Amino acid sequence: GEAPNQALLRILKETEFKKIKVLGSGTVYKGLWIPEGEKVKIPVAIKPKANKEILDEAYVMASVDNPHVCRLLGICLTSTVQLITQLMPFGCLLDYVREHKDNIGSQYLLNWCVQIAKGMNYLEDRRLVHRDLAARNVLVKTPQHVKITDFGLAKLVPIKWMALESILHRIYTHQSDVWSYGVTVWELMTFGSKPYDGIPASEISSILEKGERLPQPPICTIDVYMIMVKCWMIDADSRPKFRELIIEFSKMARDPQRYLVIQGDDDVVDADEYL
Ligand SMILES: C#Cc1cccc(Nc2ncnc3cc4c(cc23)OCCOCCOCCO4)c1
């Protein structure tokens, strides 16, 4: 009794877009997409067995439409399978936060938390479990506007971001995503620290069983840290809902310095305007 997935799968002529540079290495390039009969230029990222998987990704990305999730613009079916998406010029948020450590205020950190919760709440609406929420998989369109990406694991192994019940019984829920939301917030609040750094993943299951959790980040008031901790409750239903994380961080974002203590407080069209 599910709704029909009427998303459109756009097939792009490879002559419609111009690669311009490698961004990473699986390979992602920067380029420009010029819809043939349209006077627009669109900044884009361009990304058996392997083909099957990347098309699962294309499936998920084409089926989401929300200001805080990356949506597939199209695929190109040439010698290889290329996913074409909105270019996120500032890269992923894990790198971004490490590079600008000394220039990120409480307002930005809390706003990122709100926007990521909105993206995740949207995916919950769409009955989608991301299964790989993490700061590396959140992209930065502008410092003011981040979006969740990498749906290569989503469904309707990153041990250090995973709910305990996922490490134990490979169970995954919107509430196991909340757990990953909490590890991702911890990544941001520590300006990109590696969680459980030095602790091999084999030990993670046991550490979490003894009751250990990531420590309280220096800039974090107990209010913010307490929210993180709640995402790490053993009882998955005792963890916050995304719609609540949105609300709580919204409140905090209205007075950020009360919640984070930080020393120093032509013819181009962005994809978001190409509908
Ligand atoms: C289709 C598709 C698809 C599916 C999953 C992930 C991505 N990934 C991306 N989507 C949009 N824009 C990006 C911009 C990047 C980038 C990756 C991007 O590479 C991060 C490495 O750091 C370089 C920093 O350079 C600045 C810009 O880099 C694309």
Instruction: Assess whether the C-beta atom of 178 lies below 6 angstroms from ligand 1.
Output: no
The answer on 65 and 100 residing in a single domain is: no
Q: How far is the CA of 20 from the centre of ligand 1 (A)?
A: 13
From 87, 121, 136, the end of a domain falls on 87
Tell me the chain's radius of gyration from C-alpha atoms.
19
CATH code at position 176: 1.10.510.10
User: Burial level of 159, CB count in 10 A (0-12/13-18/19+)?
Assistant: middle
Distance, CA of 98 to CA of 192 (rounded, Å): 5
Atom of ligand 1 nearest to the CA of 151: 5
Which of 10, 20, 28, when mutated, tests ligand 1's pocket best, judged by the most ligand atoms within 8 Å of its CB? 28
Name the residue at shortest CA distance from atom 27 of ligand 1: 91
Distance, CA of 250 to CA of 57 (rounded, Å): 31
Residues 6+ apart with CB under 8 A from 229: 182, 213
Which residues are part of the catalytic machinery? 132
Distance, CA of 197 to CA of 135 (rounded, Å): 15
Amino acid at 200: P
Name the residue at shortest CA distance from atom 12 of ligand 1: 88
Instruction: Assess whether the C-beta atom of 150 lies below 6 angstroms from ligand 1.
Output: yes
Does 86 appear as a known binding residue?
A: yes
Helix 242-253 and helix 106-125, axial crossing angle in degrees, nearest 10: 160
The answer on 252 and 160 residing in a single domain is: yes
In a domain, 83, yes or no: yes
Domain that holds residue 249: 88-265
The answer on 76 and 101 residing in a single domain is: no
User: Burial level of 51, CB count in 10 A (0-12/13-18/19+)?
Assistant: exposed
Total domain count, the chain: 2
Q: How far is the CA of 15 from the centre of ligand 1 (A)?
A: 21
The answer on 131 and 239 residing in a single domain is: yes
Q: What is the SS3 assignment for the chain? A: CCCCCCCCCCECCHHHEEEEEEEECCCEEEEEECCCCCCCEEEEEECCCHHHHHHHHHHHHHCCCCCCECCEEEEEECCCEEEEEECCCCCEHHHHHHHCHHHCCHHHHHHHHHHHHHHHHHHHHCCCECCCCCHHHEEEEECCEEEECCCCCCECCCHHHCCHHHHHHCCCCHHHHHHHHHHHHHHHHCCCCCCCCCCCHHHHHHHHHHCCCCCCCCCECHHHHHHHHHCCCCCHHHCCCHHHHHHHHHHHHCCHHHCECCCCCCCECCHHHCC
In a domain, 117, yes or no: yes
From 87, 109, 136, the end of a domain falls on 87
Distance, CA of 247 to CA of 119 (rounded, Å): 13
Distance, CA of 245 to CA of 255 (rounded, Å): 16
Does 147 appear as a known binding residue?
A: no
81-86/72-77 β-pairing: antiparallel
In a domain, 126, yes or no: yes
In a domain, 188, yes or no: yes
Method: X-ray
Does 6 appear as a known binding residue?
A: no
From 87, 119, 138, the end of a domain falls on 87
The answer on 98 and 77 residing in a single domain is: no
Does 28 appear as a known binding residue?
A: yes
In a domain, 275, yes or no: no
Instruction: Assess whether the C-beta atom of 88 lies below 6 angstroms from ligand 1.
Output: yes
In a domain, 273, yes or no: no
Q: How far is the CA of 13 from the centre of ligand 1 (A)?
A: 21
